[PDB]
Short mmCIF file of N, CA and C in Angstrom, two decimals:
data_model
loop_
_atom_site.label_atom_id
_atom_site.label_comp_id
_atom_site.label_asym_id
_atom_site.label_seq_id
_atom_site.Cartn_x
_atom_site.Cartn_y
_atom_site.Cartn_z
N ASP N 1 -47.78 -197.76 113.01
CA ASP N 1 -49.11 -198.13 112.49
C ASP N 1 -49.92 -196.87 112.14
N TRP N 2 -51.14 -197.04 111.62
CA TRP N 2 -52.05 -195.95 111.26
C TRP N 2 -53.50 -196.28 111.62
N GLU N 3 -53.69 -197.08 112.67
CA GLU N 3 -55.01 -197.49 113.13
C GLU N 3 -55.70 -196.29 113.78
N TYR N 4 -56.88 -195.92 113.28
CA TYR N 4 -57.72 -194.86 113.83
C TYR N 4 -58.94 -195.45 114.55
N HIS N 5 -59.73 -194.55 115.15
CA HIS N 5 -60.97 -194.87 115.84
C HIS N 5 -62.14 -194.47 114.93
N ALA N 6 -62.26 -193.17 114.65
CA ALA N 6 -63.31 -192.58 113.81
C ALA N 6 -62.85 -192.59 112.35
N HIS N 7 -62.52 -193.79 111.87
CA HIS N 7 -62.13 -194.07 110.50
C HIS N 7 -63.16 -193.55 109.48
N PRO N 8 -62.71 -193.27 108.24
CA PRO N 8 -63.53 -192.70 107.18
C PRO N 8 -64.61 -193.68 106.71
N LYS N 9 -65.69 -193.09 106.19
CA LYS N 9 -66.87 -193.76 105.68
C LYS N 9 -66.73 -194.01 104.16
N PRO N 10 -67.59 -194.86 103.57
CA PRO N 10 -67.61 -195.11 102.13
C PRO N 10 -68.38 -193.98 101.43
N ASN N 11 -69.50 -194.27 100.75
CA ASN N 11 -70.25 -193.36 99.87
C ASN N 11 -71.16 -192.40 100.65
N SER N 12 -70.64 -191.83 101.74
CA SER N 12 -71.38 -190.96 102.63
C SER N 12 -71.87 -189.68 101.92
N UNK N 13 -71.20 -189.30 100.83
CA UNK N 13 -71.48 -188.14 99.97
C UNK N 13 -72.87 -188.18 99.31
N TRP N 14 -73.56 -189.31 99.41
CA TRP N 14 -74.86 -189.58 98.83
C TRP N 14 -76.00 -189.40 99.85
N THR N 15 -75.69 -189.03 101.10
CA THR N 15 -76.69 -188.75 102.13
C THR N 15 -77.55 -187.54 101.73
#
């Protein structure tokens, strides 16, 4: 599997 905990965010680049 490839299940993570701190999985990646969507459009976070717009913060």
